[PDB]
Design a protein around this nucleic acid. Sequence first.
DNA 1: CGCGCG
DNA 2: CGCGCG
Lengths: 65, 63
Amino acid sequence: SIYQDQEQRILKFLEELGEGKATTAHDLSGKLGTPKKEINRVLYSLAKKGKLQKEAGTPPLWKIA
Amino acid sequence: YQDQEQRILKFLEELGEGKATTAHDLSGKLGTPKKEINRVLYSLAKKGKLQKEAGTPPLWKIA
DNA sequence: CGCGCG
DNA sequence: CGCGCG
């Protein structure tokens, strides 16, 4: 599905960046060319599945867990 | 914008200055998306034309 | 301004 | 779930 494609693209991006390196949803949205709204829906979903770690803040930072 | 803004002000007035309602209610009653019912409501509240009552969801009435 | 919301 | 957000 398209949703699974976006999940895979996000995970690959965070995996390439660095396991202990985090970035914003805004950065993910721009780099992948996907609406921030869809990036966040996927980001919070993955974080709920424990695959990603959300760093408390504003805006929230994201990294591979 | 003046378009939608006067419709919401009218509804809440016909409702009665003492009575308050939600954006979700206004959205269905007026047949307008909640996203913009809220853009107008928050604007009108800032302009002092409306009073927002704290809560989840917020209640809206004529100031 | 944090927003992901169906 | 409060969301108005460009």
